[PDB]
Write a protein that binds this DNA or RNA. Structure first.
Ligand SMILES: [Mg+2]
Ligand SMILES: [Mg+2]
Ligand SMILES: [Mg+2]
Ligand SMILES: [Mg+2]
Ligand SMILES: [Mg+2]
Ligand SMILES: [Mg+2]
Ligand SMILES: [Mg+2]
Ligand SMILES: [Mg+2]
Ligand SMILES: [Mg+2]
Ligand SMILES: [Mg+2]
Ligand SMILES: [Mg+2]
Ligand SMILES: [Mg+2]
Ligand SMILES: [Mg+2]
Ligand SMILES: [Mg+2]
Ligand SMILES: [Mg+2]
Ligand SMILES: [Mg+2]
Ligand SMILES: [Mg+2]
Ligand SMILES: [Mg+2]
Ligand SMILES: [Mg+2]
Ligand SMILES: [Mg+2]
Ligand SMILES: [Mg+2]
Ligand SMILES: [Mg+2]
Ligand SMILES: [Mg+2]
Ligand SMILES: [Mg+2]
Ligand SMILES: [Zn+2]
Lengths: 86, 122, 53, 202, 118, 50
RNA sequence: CGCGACCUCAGAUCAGACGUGGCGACCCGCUGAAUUUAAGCAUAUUAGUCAGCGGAGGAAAAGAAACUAACCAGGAUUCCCUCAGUAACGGCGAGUGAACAGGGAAGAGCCCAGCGCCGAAUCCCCGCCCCGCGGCGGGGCGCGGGAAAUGUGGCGUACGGA
RNA sequence: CGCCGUUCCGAAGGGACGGGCGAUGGCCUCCGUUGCCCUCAGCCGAUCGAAAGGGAGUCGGGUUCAGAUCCCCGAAUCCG
């Protein structure tokens, strides 16, 4: 009865998609995420999981501002200039 | 007709917004042709008109930004958009004058004991 | 009245300055210049004020 | 003058200074735990520790509870060998003055801690005063005698143990007493002693 | 001025208004929910052609962020036709279908004849 | 259920539009290996997480 | 009663700034084990290590002796060879374990408070002029406002200095 | 890092009528606006917590291959 019988009672979910990390780990009762600790300011990460870091690091996403900073860097972040016109 | 960005810079703000308000109607008529079924000669003009709108709005924002930083060319406080945007640590430095500042004690040391140029005989 | 903390603090520090045995070195500041000598004093100390900006 | 307040603040066992330190400690015991002071309580000790009476210099007064560091564990039960059954009589390795300077350097994270000093204590509290500098004022930016504090290297001097009260806790120094901190720090000494140099040719 | 009540309440002081010395952003951001972006295309399905023919309505795939007010006031701009009512619904596809019912005198079938869908 | 939310109706819509076969014009390309769509999903077997 | 100071303390979508979070190989500050070794084990060892927390930089930290020495003396810090598996610690068991000198890479010094001297001789802010203007400055005006005598600037700091 | 704590060590109300002063837009008549005082004010704790608790107000008929107290027609109703 502890098995197949009590596997039907599973109907109300514990977690939902966190809004900061898009993972399905937001405990609806504790109101905090198990993947990023959303209500806490600091993203939670431990060294004892070397791989969960490599799944969430500065390369894993779009770097929509870093991949351009790495390009404006090769010229000391020049500003207010354009090439000489034709 | 190939809308180049060169012959768009002399026109006036409302002589640009009339072109915008005509290109958006040409878009609406092309997104209608797409759903009613239209010739590929028309369907392929969507990529041409979305980019004509892109060129127009680009020249509009460029003239507006040049006018803005000309109005604030010599002013002291200017919008954070016209302020030079570099890295946070590069914007939170000391000025080249704060770097090039010296106490009167070092303006007196550097003066009374300069670094002399010399050689030695071998 | 229930006063704010800073008011009650300074109002009962003026009381601690009446309950605590104040050494004569601090108590020698209560015996001060009178109200008649003060006038003539500042009268003389007005002809020798420093210069302004 | 300043040497008169100096030689006066060394007779803390006298009458006048045990009255003053006691009315000060009573008044401090009524305010908040971390509050800004209007002006330096000890102007002489503040000059000695680097306080120029000019804009940008700030003084925070802060109180800390005396006593050692009980180990944060369950009821008793520090699971380990009897060596580490100690919870009660343990001591903390950073002085209460460094803890005052870092509760100020954390409550107000924009300002840079310079030093701090003792302004009173009782059985359950120690009262310090932390000399915070505002590193983006122009009285500090332009004045070149003190524009070193405005560089990013001196962020959180007290979280990195570079203030006076902090440096006093890392056991560094030159001599035959300070051998275990030859090199950068205790861990940069430990690394070089516990590091096996394996040359190419052995 | 006697203290009539034993509760010292904080006195109300004066509060000024923001007189900035420089606007943060240089220019107001243009309204990206234009009258044109708010209406993408119509539908030509016999589920909406019976609405046009019988119910004298039209079926547009409007932007999802659009109110029935923005829709009404943007069909009265792109097509110059007074509107009876608007009924929106978000499809399982994701887009927001909108049934716009024209005034009694205006004929949907004859404004769809105009704009193209017929 | 039938008492969805907006974020969830929208996530189901995305999971509906990702559930279609590769366009037929796409394996005459040159640098091509995709024989078929392998990221497909059946509503019965795999249950979309959530 | 009122008026005006000063001190202490609040309120602002007050004018202008600043912090927050991420990364984390290396670095700085704390917290801190137990597997294992001892042919058991309890001190020791593993180890100030794994985990944990905080803070940075392109390096960090340290740094111009309250030093080493006992010589015919050396002279900031950091690094390598060597001292040295040494002196020493240790159920003196298991095991642990530096420094001085010397040869090299590099090489650089300084600054305050205080004590005195000077008419506060000093600093920040706003308004206007001209320039510079994409690292917000230079010069001139303002019986313009503040900070500061509960101490600003110049000389000056243990090698002595005035 | 944070934890404790929810009326407890708190200057915790940015509100209202009337009056006086001041300004504003127009049949500048007479209301409305916002600036300054005068008068008055309890509260009890920011905020969250129920598609079964509390919670104003829509019913008939027709219609689709799949939607109807939702669309069409006809009758109402609450709130501002
Ligand atoms: Mg539960
Ligand atoms: Mg240092
Ligand atoms: Mg000591
Ligand atoms: Mg403001
Ligand atoms: Mg064993
Ligand atoms: Mg064994
Ligand atoms: Mg065993
Ligand atoms: Mg042991
Ligand atoms: Mg050891
Ligand atoms: Mg320790
Ligand atoms: Mg670790
Ligand atoms: Mg952390
Ligand atoms: Mg950080
Ligand atoms: Mg950096
Ligand atoms: Mg350094
Ligand atoms: Mg020395
Ligand atoms: Mg040496
Ligand atoms: Mg040596
Ligand atoms: Mg050499
Ligand atoms: Mg000097
Ligand atoms: Mg001096
Ligand atoms: Mg709590
Ligand atoms: Mg609610
Ligand atoms: Mg209910
Ligand atoms: Zn999450």
């Amino acid at each position: 009865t502890k098995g197949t019988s009590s596997f039907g009672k599973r109907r109300n979910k514990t977690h939902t998609l966190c809004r900061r990390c898009g993972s399905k780990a937001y405990h609806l009762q504790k109101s905090t995420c198990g993947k990023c600790g959303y209500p806490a300011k600091r993203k939670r990460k431990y060294n004892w999981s070397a791989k969960a870091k490599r799944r969430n690091t500065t390369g894993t996403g779009r770097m929509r501002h870093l991949k351009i900073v790495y390009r404006r860097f090769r010229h000391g972040f020049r500003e207010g200039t354009t090439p000489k016109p034709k | 007709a190939k809308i180049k960005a060169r012959d768009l810079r002399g026109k006036k703000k409302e002589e640009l917004l009339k072109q915008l308000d005509d290109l958006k109607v040409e878009l609406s008529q092309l997104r209608v042709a797409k759903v009613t079924g239209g010739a590929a000669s028309k369907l392929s003009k969507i990529r041409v008109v979305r980019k004509s709108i892109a060129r127009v709005l680009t020249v509009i924002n460029q003239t507006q930004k040049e006018n803005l930083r000309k109005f604030y060319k010599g002013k002291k406080y200017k919008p954070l958009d016209l302020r030079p945007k570099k890295t946070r640590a590069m914007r939170r430095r000391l000025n080249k004058h704060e770097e090039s500042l010296k106490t009167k004690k070092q303006q007196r040391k550097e003066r009374l004991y300069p670094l002399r140029k010399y050689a030695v005989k071998a | 009245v229930k006063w704010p903390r800073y008011i009650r603090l300074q109002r009962q520090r003026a009381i601690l300055y009446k309950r605590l045995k104040v050494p004569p070195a601090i108590n020698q500041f209560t015996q001060v210049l009178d109200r008649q000598t003060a006038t003539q004093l500042l009268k003389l100390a007005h002809k020798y004020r420093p210069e302004t900006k | 003058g300043y040497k008169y307040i100096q030689e006066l603040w060394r007779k803390k066992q006298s009458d006048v200074m045990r009255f003053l330190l006691r009315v000060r400690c009573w008044q401090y015991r009524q305010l908040s735990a971390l509050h800004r002071a209007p002006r330096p309580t000890r102007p002489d000790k503040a000059r000695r520790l680097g306080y120029k009476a000019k804009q940008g210099y700030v003084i925070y007064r802060i109180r800390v509870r005396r006593g050692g560091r009980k180990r944060p564990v369950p009821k008793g039960a520090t699971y380990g060998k009897p060596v580490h059954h100690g919870v009660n009589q343990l001591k903390f390795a950073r002085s209460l003055q460094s803890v005052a300077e870092e509760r100020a350097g954390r409550h107000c994270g924009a300002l840079r801690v310079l030093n701090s000093y003792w302004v009173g204590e009782d059985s359950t509290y120690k009262f310090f005063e932390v000399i915070l500098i505002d590193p983006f004022h122009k009285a500090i930016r332009r004045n070149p005698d003190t524009q070193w504090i405005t560089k990013p290297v001196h962020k959180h001097r007290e979280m990195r143990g570079l203030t006076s009260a902090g440096r006093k806790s890392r056991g560094l120094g030159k001599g035959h007493k300070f051998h275990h901190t030859i090199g950068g720090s205790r861990r940069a000494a430990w690394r070089r002693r516990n590091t096996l140099q394996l040359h190419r040719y052995r | 001025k006697i203290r009539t009540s034993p509760t010292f309440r904080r006195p109300k002081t004066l509060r000024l208004r923001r007189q900035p010395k420089y606007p943060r952003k240089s220019a107001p951001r243009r309204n990206k929910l234009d009258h044109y972006a708010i209406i993408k295309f119509p539908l030509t399905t016999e589920s909406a052609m019976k609405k046009i023919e019988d119910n004298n309505t039209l079926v547009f795939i409007v932007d999802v962020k659009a109110n029935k007010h923005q829709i009404k006031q943007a069909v009265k701009k792109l097509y110059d036709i007074d509107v009876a009512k608007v009924n929106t619904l978000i499809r399982p596809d994701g887009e927001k279908k909108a049934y716009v019912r024209l005034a009694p005198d205006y004929d949907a079938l004859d404004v769809a004849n105009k704009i193209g869908i017929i | 259920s039938s008492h969805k939310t907006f974020r969830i109706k929208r996530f189901l819509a995305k999971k509906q539009k990702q559930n279609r076969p590769i366009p037929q014009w796409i394996w005459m390309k040159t640098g091509n290996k995709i024989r078929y769509n392998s990221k497909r999903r059946h509503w019965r077997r795999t249950k979309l997480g959530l």
